[PDB]
Amino acid sequence: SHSLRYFVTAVSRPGFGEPRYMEVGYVDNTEFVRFDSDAENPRYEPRARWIEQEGPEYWERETRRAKGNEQSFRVDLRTALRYYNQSAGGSHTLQWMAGCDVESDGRLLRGYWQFAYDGCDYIALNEDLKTWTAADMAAQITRRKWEQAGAAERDRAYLEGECVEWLRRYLKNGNATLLRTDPPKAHVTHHRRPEGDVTLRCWALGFYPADITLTWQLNGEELTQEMELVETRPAGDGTFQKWASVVVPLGKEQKYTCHVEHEGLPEPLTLRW
């Protein structure tokens, strides 16, 4: 499955001018566009090589939309203070996420249109794309406003309509970057612990996409018992990295195998120390 998602944030800062407003857009999970109100000459800007192909009317159009959205979030931050009876001196955050998951058959899988205030769920469009889930009483007010205003149907028209169609466009125009694969380069480090045994750490570097399996074996049987791990984490260049470690007895290292499974490999990588 593929996706086009937009992550949006407005943060208030009373006494330091208007709220900071930011937009980021992703295809699958890769950043390609961004808008930041604290930039010099704030405009929608490319963040990936393949989107630069778009003509000037694309960037003028998206900059107009972002500036329109920034104004709405200014009102929403002021409204939020009333709904929760909060003083107007504090910093508050409002977050928005909207986009579409589609399959290869071009079919919408899921559509998202959800908000959070000060880091907690506020209102979310349900999977039917017709009803709203409202967290607290304050969000139920909003739900009533949006119910009588037909909000769901207008917003659904973006989710089933423009979102799906531009994702197809982005997937063809960015195909060589988005659907590429980069294989993992793996190695193993060896560190004697103070207790005399040895930490073996298996690294996988520079792979794309992010999904990967990293396991330790002992002549054939996996070792999820004493296996330390980090979550997959990003590099600047758009690739990822991961490691898993086990503790083994000194001098018996060559009995342990690290296994790496990834799209960019035809067959799994086996390696030992």
Binding site: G25, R61, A66, G68, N69, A98, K145, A151, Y158, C163
Partner: peptide
Amino acid sequence: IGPGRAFYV
């Protein structure tokens, strides 16, 4: 193309 706000909270 991104989404556009048309309703207020």
